[PDB]
Amino acid sequence: AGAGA
Amino acid sequence: AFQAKLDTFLWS
Amino acid sequence: AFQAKLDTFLWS
Amino acid sequence: FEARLVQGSILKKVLEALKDLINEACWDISSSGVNLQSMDSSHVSLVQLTLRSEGFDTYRCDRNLAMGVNLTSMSKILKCAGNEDIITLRAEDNADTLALVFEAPNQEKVSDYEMKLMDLDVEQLGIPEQEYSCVVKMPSGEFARICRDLSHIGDAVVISCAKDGVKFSASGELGNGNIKLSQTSNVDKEEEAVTIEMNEPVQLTFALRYLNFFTKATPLSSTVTLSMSADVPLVVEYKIADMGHLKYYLAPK
Amino acid sequence: FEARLVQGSILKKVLEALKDLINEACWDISSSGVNLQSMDSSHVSLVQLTLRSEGFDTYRCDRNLAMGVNLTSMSKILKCAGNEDIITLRAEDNADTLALVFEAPNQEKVSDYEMKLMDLDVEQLGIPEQEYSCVVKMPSGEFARICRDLSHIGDAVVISCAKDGVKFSASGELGNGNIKLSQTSNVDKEEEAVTIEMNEPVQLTFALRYLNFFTKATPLSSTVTLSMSADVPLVVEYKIADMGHLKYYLAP
Amino acid sequence: FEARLVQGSILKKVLEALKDLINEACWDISSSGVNLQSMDSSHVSLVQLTLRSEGFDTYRCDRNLAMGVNLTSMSKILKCAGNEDIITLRAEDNADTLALVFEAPNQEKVSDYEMKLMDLDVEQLGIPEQEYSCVVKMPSGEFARICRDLSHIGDAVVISCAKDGVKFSASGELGNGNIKLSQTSNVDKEEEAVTIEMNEPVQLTFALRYLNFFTKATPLSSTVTLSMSADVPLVVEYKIADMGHLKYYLAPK
């Protein structure tokens, strides 16, 4: 569940 | 001395 | 780089 | 069942006064109001809360109700309440959950918590109701300070009450300490008077730890009332301003 | 590189807002200003700090510069600064150190600290893009209070946002709690107002822990802006004076 | 023995400033007043407390006397004193305890505590009185803040005193820090001026931990005086109200 944005 | 419990004083 | 004791500075 | 209280902070205080001493209790709700009563785990103290239905800014109770409550959880929920929040208690009508509703004073924030209840088997109801040899009324803060202080000295306190004044003595491995409070007589003091009603002199011994638990009710009342007779439990009474009281019974030593 | 800020408190306040969430971050310095950007160790959240050069009372940057900084160290150093001190960062030449100069507003006291920098050769990113379905502006203290509160109830908050208002929900063992905020009729004050710019209603669950780390940015702004769309990370945004912003990105 | 002192806080603060630095000490009560003199367990620092007898509201002294006490016990007892209490100290006994009486100023509360004494052998080797190379007078709070702040950086502080100002330096794992205090060129009749009386410049190194023990006496005075000469112990000096002084001597590194 990485941010990335 | 003695640490009493309240059970002796409770009214059953 | 080390602590000195106070005793040597007291009046003896 | 539905009870509305504008001074929600009261409730907060109440639970801060109970949550550490008792973790579970049953709430008797009736047309007369709300009664709680529960001894602590060690059977040495007993807590009795009474809030008359007339004290709430709204009250409606259709059936006698007895809801098992975990006071820790309810404390957590009341911690999410604001100090000036208007707090309403809502019961479903069946035995399911207890709703707590916190209205921010300006109506634009509303919180609703629904707390799971417990199934506890209620009983007893009765400390035996005495006429006491000594009744001391004093400021609550003063009492709190006295217990706090003497807990530094010893684990137990000896309350020696005579007509002139009351004495609080403690002894330990530090030494000992006496705190003497003289009765305020013709000197005009009201809230901060020390007034002693004495029939016979008393000299009882109690565990300071429990008292230091009781003093957590200090924010509820500017005075505390101590009722004493020999060889019977002590009554530490806090008035919940205009709507009732919160009293602690403590078995002696 | 030399950057001086009369209102040192802000810098203090920023480090406090960052140091616990990200221990080690790389500062990107240019004549445009400072851009800090980092994920936490779990890579769930993303902190993006921007401080444009115009906000500083003096700003020099010969060459675009990248400093590996331990933020707990820098915070410990900034606690040594008074709340009203004039704070000057200086890194003239990569000396492998960052100098901090705290000046008493009445000039009789001056401190200078030197901080060992870290080697962080993998670099940035920086994508604050998007149009969002819901954009909520609210008091920062209120949001903080709410995250803290619902942390009691559960470890996850459900944000349900519609035209009328926004709902914050939590469910746990003891029970459940819902905190409703209605869009206030008129905006005013140093902000007690709740504003909702909505294209489409949304509803997203986030971890309360991380939010409780974000709310450490409360001292920076009276307001906080929550930007949400489905299948994109929430953006918790605090405006920093007129010189920039602190944005937290939290994947749902 | 018998000594009364109206503002209790002083005493409280005095014992707050000592108990964690020195565990037990001997109180030399003479007609001239009260003198404590004790090194910490490690003999790196020396506390010299003086409380002249005229600074007391009431002072009596039959015999010169040496009372060995546990400062931790005494501090724990003074916690039970109100900040505005009138504190009486009384030890005129042959079976020696120390009585501490706390009178709440204008109310009916009187506390009395008995504290068991100890036999400690007095010596007072004493520091030779000299005129120092540098004397730095500054606000106490500032000194406290500096020692605390530099303890964040390193374990030892280098004090560089010249004519213009004084510098406090430290270095450790994080890196280093220098804090410069110029001599104050400011108006105000308040006590935040930094004044330096220098005969010759000094640069000396001291253990920050001990200084962080010293700074606990900050509540006692608005200023602190630092006295320095090459290769001799630092003197950190706080005025105790206006009735005496508290001196810390710290062997250099």
Curated annotation (Swiss-Prot), chain E:
GO MF assignments: chromatin binding; damaged DNA binding; dinucleotide insertion or deletion binding; DNA polymerase binding; DNA polymerase processivity factor activity; enzyme binding; histone acetyltransferase binding; identical protein binding
Intrachain disulfide bonds: C134-C161
Principal subcellular localization: nucleus
DNA-binding keyword on record: yes
Keyword DNA repair: yes
Effect recorded for A251G: Complete loss of interaction with UHRF2
Record location of the Glycyl lysine isopeptide (Lys-Gly) (interchain with G-Cter in SUMO2) cross-link: K163
UniProt-listed SUPFAM superfamilies: DNA clamp
One GO BP annotation of this record: cellular response to xenobiotic stimulus
PTM comment, free text: Phosphorylated. Phosphorylation at Tyr-210 by EGFR stabilizes chromatin-associated PCNA.
CC terms in the record's Gene Ontology section: centrosome; chromatin; chromosome, telomeric region; cyclin-dependent protein kinase holoenzyme complex; extracellular exosome; male germ cell nucleus; nuclear body; nuclear lamina
Domain of life: Eukaryota
DNA-binding annotation, residue ranges on this chain: 60-79
Cross-link (Glycyl lysine isopeptide (Lys-Gly) (interchain with G-Cter in ubiquitin)): K163
Short name of one Pfam family: PCNA_N
Residues carrying N6-acetyllysine: K13, K76, K79, K247
Phosphotyrosine, modified sites: Y210
UniProt cross-references to InterPro entries, sorted A to Z: DNA_clamp_sf, Pr_cel_nuc_antig, Pr_cel_nuc_antig_C, Pr_cel_nuc_antig_CS, Pr_cel_nuc_antig_N
Family the UniProt entry places it in: Belongs to the PCNA family.
Quaternary structure annotation from Swiss-Prot or TrEMBL: Homotrimer. Interacts with p300/EP300; the interaction occurs on chromatin in UV-irradiated damaged cells. Interacts with CREBBP (via transactivation domain and C-terminus); the interaction occurs on chromatin in UV-irradiated damaged cells. Directly interacts with POLD1, POLD3 and POLD4 subunits of the DNA polymerase delta complex, POLD3 being the major interacting partner; the interaction with POLD3 is inhibited by CDKN1A/p21(CIP1). Forms a complex with activator 1 heteropentamer in the presence of ATP. Interacts with EXO1, POLH, POLK, DNMT1, ERCC5, FEN1, CDC6 and POLDIP2.
Additional note from the record: Antibodies against PCNA are present in sera from patients with systemic lupus erythematosus.
Clinical note on disease: Ataxia-telangiectasia-like disorder 2: A neurodegenerative disorder due to defects in DNA excision repair. ATLD2 is characterized by developmental delay, ataxia, sensorineural hearing loss, short stature, cutaneous and ocular telangiectasia, and photosensitivity.
Role played: Auxiliary protein of DNA polymerase delta and epsilon, is involved in the control of eukaryotic DNA replication by increasing the polymerase's processibility during elongation of the leading strand. Induces a robust stimulatory effect on the 3'-5' exonuclease and 3'-phosphodiesterase, but not apurinic-apyrimidinic (AP) endonuclease, APEX2 activities. Has to be loaded onto DNA in order to be able to stimulate APEX2.
Protein name: Proliferating cell nuclear antigen
Organism: Homo sapiens (Human)
Gene symbol of the encoding locus: PCNA
